[PDB]
């Protein structure tokens, strides 16, 4: 997150860190056994780290659980990033408490103008590099289809929305990838892509979770 603030420890209990030796992506816990993240975050040997604030200090609320099964969406295209969504099942169920909590799947897509919480351990600089040890947060609006398709012509599908600030200055960034875009208690988006970070007229593009509820459901049911 560029241009946000420090969330405060455990104030976003559904936020996961994906660790494969180090933090490499965010995710969202959606029930005791499952995490949703972006497909472009796919790796082998993923450890899901729950209840995290400082990803470099053991603070006493963490649960570390290895991935049982990874499932990249059946239609993930990596050149266009269409269908950038992915499920991970946990070797064992997370103990749900107020430091480790799941987020609801949407029942309907948010409209442009809806305000959402985006969070992660991604780069915090628009120029240059700085990765925080603590979870960072940002409140950002959803942008109309029109203005999104104007920022990235020929690049936005009906499985993507833009969210953020066209004047730039505030955005998600690398390392936030795969993490939550939560609007009014529902997971609407997944940090997916964008040209640079917090650049003018290049807002953040997110996977539109409301299209995948069916698939998620479903996949959970038979696995």
User: Does residue 23 have an active-site annotation?
Assistant: no
Measured from the CB of residue 14, what is the shortest distance to Ca ion in angstroms? 16
- Could you list the residues that contact Ca ion (CB under 5 A)? 52, 54, 59
62 marked among binding-site residues: yes
Measured from the CB of residue 59, what is the shortest distance to Ca ion in angstroms? 5
52 marked among binding-site residues: yes
Nearer to Ca ion, 51 or 106 (CB): 51
Q: What is the 3-state secondary structure (H, E, C) of the chain?
A: CECCEECCCCCCCCEEEEECCCEEEEEEEEECCEEEECHHHCCCCCEEEECCCCCCCCCCCCEEEEEEEEEECCCCCCCCCCCCCEEEEECCCCCCECCECCCECCCCCCCCCCEEEEEECCCCCCCCCCCCCCCEEEEEEECCHHHHHHHCCCCCCCCEEEECCCCCCCECCCCCCCCEEEECCEEEEEEEECCCCCCCCCCEEEEEHHHCHHHHHHHCCCC
User: Does residue 84 have an active-site annotation?
Assistant: yes
174 marked among binding-site residues: yes
Nearer to Ca ion, 54 or 199 (CB): 54
Nearer to Ca ion, 54 or 126 (CB): 54
Measured from the CB of residue 54, what is the shortest distance to Ca ion in angstroms? 5
Catalytic residue among 84, 102, 176, 192: 84
User: Does residue 40 have an active-site annotation?
Assistant: yes
171 marked among binding-site residues: yes
Numbered residues of the known binding site for Ca(2+): 52, 54, 57, 62
Residue numbers annotated as active site: 40, 84, 177
Numbered residues of the known binding site for substrate: 171-172, 174-175, 177
């Amino acid at each position: 997150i560029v241009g946000g603030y420090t969330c405060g420890a455990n104030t976003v209990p559904y936020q996961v860190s994906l660790n494969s030796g180090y933090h490499f992506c965010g995710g969202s816990l959606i029930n005791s056994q499952w995490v949703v993240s972006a497909a472009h975050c796919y790796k082998s040997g993923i450890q899901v780290r729950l209840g995290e604030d400082n990803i470099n200090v053991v603070e006493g609320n963490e649960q570390f659980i290895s991935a049982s099964k990874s499932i990249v969406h059946p239609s993930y295209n990596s050149n266009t990033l269409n269908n950038d969504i992915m499920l991970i099942k946990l070797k064992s169920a997370a103990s749900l408490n107020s430091r480790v909590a799941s987020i609801s799947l949407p029942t309907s897509c948010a409209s442009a103008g809806t305000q959402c919480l985006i969070s992660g351990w991604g780069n915090t600089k628009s120029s240059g590099t700085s990765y925080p040890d603590v979870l960072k947060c940002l409140k950002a609006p959803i942008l109309s289809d029109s203005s999104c398709k104007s920022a990235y012509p020929g690049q936005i599908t009906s499985n993507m929305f833009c969210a953020g600030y066209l004047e730039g200055g505030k955005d998600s960034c690398q390392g936030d990838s795969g993490g939550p875009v939560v609007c009014s208690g529902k997971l609407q988006g997944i940090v997916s892509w964008g040209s640079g970070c917090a650049q003018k007229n290049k807002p953040g593009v997110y996977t539109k979770v409301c299209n995948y509820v069916s698939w998620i459901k479903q996949t959970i049911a038979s696995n």
